[PDB]
């Protein structure tokens, strides 16, 4: 119909004249698509707002990572006769205690790994330990349904906390109050006054086993993640839940508080996510660890460690959410390949040594390579702007 | 206590029962079964027809019996992750 001819300039003036570098690679060239007919009163405004949202997202996923130095194995302590399920470090950073499946709580010397006394008195596997920083006590819990208070001045059990219909999987101590929280298979987290052994609060909101726990002084004070894949933020004053976080798809087995940033990270089989506390606002993913994440430990200098059920170990840069090191745990000689696993882990008080509890009857201690030199120990390479996250 | 039980009832619901050296094995079994169900529910990806827990538990029990009787227990169609998890839990039980 040759109403007009010669796309010769149009076919070039259209493609060329814009920002040369791709901004989000899907930028619709806002100025180019006004001139079509259609429904610009509503659809165009919605499309422009959406384009703004996606460009904001793609730009905000591009934080430059920091170096952070790699980690290496330094000690392999092999004394336990069962899977090591829990670990805690005393506030003075002199010794740490680990429970295991052989009913025993072994107290080790942090600097040397030399075994101090071994505590016995549990009927089944020990699943949680906590050394009180304000009392000379050591609380423990196990699949034998009872929570014990060991007096570390006499190495003897003094208190028993009784109400629990099934095994207990986690134990945490309130930083300020004289109260402790335990959560177990009865789908209930229970709040115990230390002195009177009374179950003041029964935080019953979940539908299945509460596999994780976290306690702090600010509200939310108790954070429980369970088999439901739901994380619940509790109001300890009233014993009622405030916010429920259902972003996870599978059971959330790891909860961890950032020491200095008032945020916490939770992990599950699919993804690791972290939130801002007062409202539980989602703040991003730590993608890359495709394994059953059992542990999460945040350092003081913004380093997060995620240990998996198959021995996979990934160190993350907290700020940028970048996995800067992949490590595979190697079993001690007598074990099977299926025996590679990690159940508990914890940074020591300084944050320079990482303690790992294995499905291997071994405790492994990891140390940053001391030479540093970002030129000689590069992290995993970082590639920006591949695509916006699906979300 | 006697008069309270006379004028009140059992109040049996909501009470716990400690493990008393006769329930140790039967409770250890419950805890192990629950743990294996958890691991099953985790390692299976999304939308893979989750209705498979009972058969895997039967496989685990058969593996334990074969270990007790010193028999290989080598199963043709079992996927590798399930087989590995069963071996892991069987080794735990055997060490106990």
């Amino acid at each position: 119909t040759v109403r007009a001819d010669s796309e010769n300039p149009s076919s070039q003036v259209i493609t060329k004249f814009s920002d040369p570098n791709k901004k989000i690679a899907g930028q619709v060239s806002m100025q180019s698509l006004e001139k079509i007919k259609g429904v610009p009163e509503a659809a165009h405004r919605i499309a422009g707002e959406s384009q703004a949202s996606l460009v904001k997202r793609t730009l905000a996923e591009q934080i430059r990572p920091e170096w952070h130095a790699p980690w290496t194995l330094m000690r392999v302590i092999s004394g336990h006769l069962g899977w090591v399920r829990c670990v805690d470090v005393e506030p003075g950073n002199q010794w740490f205690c680990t429970g295991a499946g052989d009913r025993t709580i072994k107290i080790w010397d942090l600097a040397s790994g030399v075994l101090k006394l071994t505590l016995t008195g549990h009927i089944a596997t020990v699943r949680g330990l906590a050394v009180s920083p304000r009392h000379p006590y050591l609380f423990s819990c196990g699949e034998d349904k009872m929570v014990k208070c060991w007096d570390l001045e006499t190495n003897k059990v003094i208190r028993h906390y009784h109400g629990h219909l099934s095994g207990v999987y986690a134990l945490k101590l309130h930083p300020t109050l004289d109260v402790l929280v335990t959560a177990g298979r009865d789908a209930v987290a229970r709040v115990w006054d230390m002195r009177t052994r009374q179950n003041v609060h029964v935080l019953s909101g979940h539908k299945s086993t509460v596999a994780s726990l976290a306690v702090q002084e600010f509200d939310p004070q108790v954070v429980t993640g369970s088999m439901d894949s739901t994380i619940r933020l509790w109001d300890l004053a009233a014993g009622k839940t405030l916010t429920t976080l259902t972003h996870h798809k599978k059971t959330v087995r790891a909860l961890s508080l950032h020491p200095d940033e008032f945020t916490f990270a939770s992990g599950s089989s699919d993804n690791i996510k972290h939130w801002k506390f007062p409202e539980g606002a989602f703040m991003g993913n730590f993608e890359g660890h495709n394994a059953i994440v059992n542990t999460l430990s945040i350092n003081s200098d913004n380093v997060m460690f995620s240990g998996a059920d198959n021995g996979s170990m990934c160190f993350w840069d907290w700020k940028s959410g970048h996995k800067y090191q992949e490590l595979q745990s190697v079993v001690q000689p007598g074990s099977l390949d299926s025996e590679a696993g990690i159940f508990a882990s914890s940074f020591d008080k300084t944050g320079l040594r990482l303690i790992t509890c294995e499905a291997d009857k071994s405790v492994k201690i990891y140390k940053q390579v001391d030479n540093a030199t970002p030129e000689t120990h590069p992290n995993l390479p970082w590639t920006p702007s591949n695509l916006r996250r699906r979300y | 206590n006697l008069l309270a039980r006379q004028f009140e009832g059992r109040h049996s619901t909501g009470v716990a029962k400690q493990i008393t050296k006769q329930r140790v094995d039967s409770h250890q079994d419950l805890e192990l079964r629950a743990a294996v169900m958890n691991d099953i529910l985790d390692m299976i990806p999304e939308g893979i027809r989750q209705g498979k827990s009972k058969t895997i538990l039967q496989h685990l029990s058969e593996a334990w019996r074969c270990w007790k009787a010193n028999i290989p227990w080598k199963v043709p169609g079992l996927p590798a992750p399930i087989e590995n998890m069963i071996l892991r839990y069987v080794k735990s039980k055997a060490d106990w």
Partner: peptide, 20 residues
């Protein structure tokens, strides 16, 4: 041979190593 016959973007889970 008889024994060997008788017996952005994201990814899926990986678990351990298998030995016959």
């Amino acid at each position: 041979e008889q024994h060997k016959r008788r017996f952005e973007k994201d990814k899926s889970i990986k678990t351990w190593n298998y030995q016959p």
